[PDB]
Amino acid sequence: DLLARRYATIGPHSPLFYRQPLELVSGSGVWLTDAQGKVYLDGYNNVPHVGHANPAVADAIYQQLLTVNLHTRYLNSRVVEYAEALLSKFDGALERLFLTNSGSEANELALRIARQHTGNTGVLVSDFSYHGNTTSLAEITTGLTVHEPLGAHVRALRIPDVSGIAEVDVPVLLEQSLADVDAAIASLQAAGHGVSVFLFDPLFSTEGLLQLPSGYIEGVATRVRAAGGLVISDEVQSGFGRTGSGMWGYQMFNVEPELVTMGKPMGNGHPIGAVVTTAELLDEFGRHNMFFNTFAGNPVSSAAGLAVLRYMDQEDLMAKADQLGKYIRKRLENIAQRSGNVGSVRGRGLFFGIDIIESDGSRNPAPALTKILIEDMRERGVLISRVGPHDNVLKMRPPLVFGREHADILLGQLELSLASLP
Amino acid sequence: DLLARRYATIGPHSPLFYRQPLELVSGSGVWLTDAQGKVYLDGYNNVPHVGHANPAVADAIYQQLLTVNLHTRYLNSRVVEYAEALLSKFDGALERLFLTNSGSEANELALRIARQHTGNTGVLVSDFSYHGNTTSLAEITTGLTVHEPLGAHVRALRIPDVSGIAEVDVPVLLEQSLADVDAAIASLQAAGHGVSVFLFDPLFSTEGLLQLPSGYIEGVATRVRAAGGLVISDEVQSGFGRTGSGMWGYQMFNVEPELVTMGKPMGNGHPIGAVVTTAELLDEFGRHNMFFNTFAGNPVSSAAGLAVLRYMDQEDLMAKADQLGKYIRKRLENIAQRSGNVGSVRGRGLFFGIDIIESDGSRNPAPALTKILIEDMRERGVLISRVGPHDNVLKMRPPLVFGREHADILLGQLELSLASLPQ
Ligand SMILES: *Cc1c(COP(=O)(O)O)cnc(C)c1O
Ligand SMILES: *Cc1c(COP(=O)(O)O)cnc(C)c1O
Secondary structure, eight states: OHHHHHHTTTOSOSOOOSSSOOBEEEEEBTEEEETTOOEEEESSOOSSTTOBTOHHHHHHHHHHHTTOOOOTTSBOHHHHHHHHHHHTTOOTTOOEEEEESSHHHHHHHHHHHHHHHHSOOOEEEETTOOOOSSHHHHTTOOSSOOSSOOOTTEEEEOOOOOTTOOGGGHHHHHHHHHHHHHHHHHHHHHTTOOOOEEEEOTTOTTTTOOOOOTTHHHHHHHHHHHTTOEEEEEOTTTTTTTTSSOSSGGGGSSOOOSEEEEOGGGGBTBOOEEEEEOHHHHHHHHHHOOOOOSSTTOHHHHHHHHHHHHHHHHTTHHHHHHHHHHHHHHHHHHHHHHOTTEEEEEEETTEEEEEEBOSSSSOOBOHHHHHHHHHHHHHTTEEOEEESTTSOEEEEOOOTTOOHHHHHHHHHHHHHHHHTOO | OHHHHHHTTTOSOSOOOSSSOOBEEEEEBTEEEETTOOEEEESSOOSSTTOBTOHHHHHHHHHHHTTOOOOTTSBOHHHHHHHHHHHTTOOTTOOEEEEESSHHHHHHHHHHHHHHHHSOOOEEEETTOOOOSSHHHHTTOOSSOOSSOOOTTEEEEOOOOOTTOOGGGHHHHHHHHHHHHHHHHHHHHHTTOOOOEEEEOTTOTTTTOOOOOTTHHHHHHHHHHHTTOEEEEEOTTTTTTTTSSSSSGGGGSSOOOSEEEEOGGGGBTBOOEEEEEOHHHHHHHHHHOOOOOSSTTOHHHHHHHHHHHHHHHHTTHHHHHHHHHHHHHHHHHHHHHHOTTEEEEEEETTEEEEEEBOSSSSOOBOHHHHHHHHHHHHHTTEEOEEESTTSOEEEEOOOTTOOHHHHHHHHHHHHHHHHTSOO
16 A cells, blocks of 8 residues: 555655545646546646646656766756856846755755855744755744744744735835834844845745735845845746746846745756856855755756756747736636635736635635635646645646646636535 | 856856866766767766666656656655665664755755754764765865854864774774764763764765774764764765675664765766655654655656666676675785885775875875876876875776776776876
């Protein structure tokens, strides 16, 4: 029995989705098949950015595996080709790269570059976030359970959300949120840490897909820079065109970060991450450290990353996601008008969510109804999930090859699922 | 244009070998070809454990890539099959696994498990070691340049080496080295760190390929456990049958570590690492943390690691490395007797080295002569490197598919190169 064999090797704690674990044995594009032969529409996975079993990615890997696959202490063209392609997707002073093998490795390295450059240790993060699984990341984690107490060098911020707030009240929410930033900064200075970084997910997805007031990110950047710190945009959830309106999530705001980190989608499932930064910051850190990552930038990893960028450009996926997101938003707003169990509609491009609420007039978060909806949608052949501190934001985030025919399948089942609640 | 295009993107500090960097465009087995068409014998690379362009590994990866490639929050058989195969290579209480994507990820996680389990933060490492590139690892690094000052929670040990010492002086060396361990432990305790771990490469390769007196590792383990700490064997250099005499380098000592880390060879070049541990340790850490690594244990990484183990088993590579290492050692002992520029013969299996020295009677380390030999061997069609705090231990560590014919090519060029040094 597979579950028992898993528990005897990797253990019973490593997480599994659903009340009954699901065994997935094959996939193609947006479609997955279980060990019983049931077929599902993927409304969840972002690692297969260009679709399950994409054959252009598979072929690029295979052909390089039959050539050579050594570390970067020997010259080889593939890593340079990939670095050129990836950096062509950045403007401004973001013109150099460190490659890694995961998003956690990228965020660990970005915090290390910042601590050395600033001479400060303080970290500003959201109060319900997750950026990876190393010791330095565990000490700043607020959105998942870790044994490490929150570090004395960390201040957690309540990131503002305008969802459901009267427009007249927005400027005061912005003002109070920026005063909380000044107070965090002043506390870190008084206690001798100073300010090293502000680190954020531009979609604020773990937090419940927040809609920020205009001027908050710009305001935080100005205050952090007056204090001698840097801004890191973690693009693991929001990058590679997921938002539709730009390649990188930070482009939704009036900010150009000094450091950008990435992972998940980048190699369609191959282990790849990166830190994109300025010439000054890369040169300084290399003068000061004999830094080397053995697997980073090998020719096969580089072939995989090049095939992902080439495929997304040839198939126009970012522009498609921008157009389709406009359609999905209209459909979800109609659904919210018709269901007493739906609150705000959140997100853009191919990252959407809806708040699930009691229909008794309270508008209280309904996490038990949300779990019903996730399990019912699985029975109906659709894989979705949830996010947020009240466990009630129903999330829709498929591979970036998801089209209008797929949107109509997902949205039709979701309507039937909502209609079946009490 | 390639070198300049590199420096404009990933920068001019990321390291390159040789005075003139080499552009390697293809390989097969132990052989590599440069952009000018020159062919070289690989006496250096351990990442392509089963040889360059190995087709069984390539086929296994590609077939899984046509099937599915999702994280471990859905059940899938390939990760379980690989975990069973890897854990069958271990004995005793080493019966659970955390997968990762790199050796640094593995050693970061092992230090984290240990700090939470012990309630202590103190680290014992050698005084010329390297275990990876995270913040927590930089703070303990002694064998490579980093900006971080050595952490106050760290004590660096001078690991004893019997190479070239009279047998009658070995017991005093062991007694004095264990007293240094007693002192380091007491110092950690007085400062309020306590002892969390002793972390070591069993080959002590970065340190210059040391030959330890019997009882040193075992003595360190007893003292660390009495202090409430754990032992971590870093198998990135010594694992997967590199030493010939066992699957894991720790087996050269009479010790069973609580935690074993690995990387480099394990996927032939695919990004894979692991921490192997006990049931008690894995269960404790998962009860206390919602631990998850998104790429770890995906089906394609699992296919790669299963193909490496299957190939090394089918081709009998560990046993072949044990027999071939015995033959290389005899040849290198003959070379050392005859050359006034060679000191001791070091290593075993397919990880060997020799110490390059002046022939003026001083026996002083000769780093500049070592560099001459490395460049000369390149010109002769052989890739080798060096290690150690004096930059004078010539290092040879080929793919594990390297055989007797290849050994004779390498060793014959090495003798001719040695003979060309000034008198
Ligand atoms: C998944 C994730 C990470 C960690 O990536 P890993 O590859 O599991 O190390 C970091 N940041 C964000 C926002 C993530 O979603
Ligand atoms: C290379 C190496 C590491 C780090 O491995 P990466 O895969 O580069 O993180 C750790 N320990 C030892 C002994 C190594 O040789």
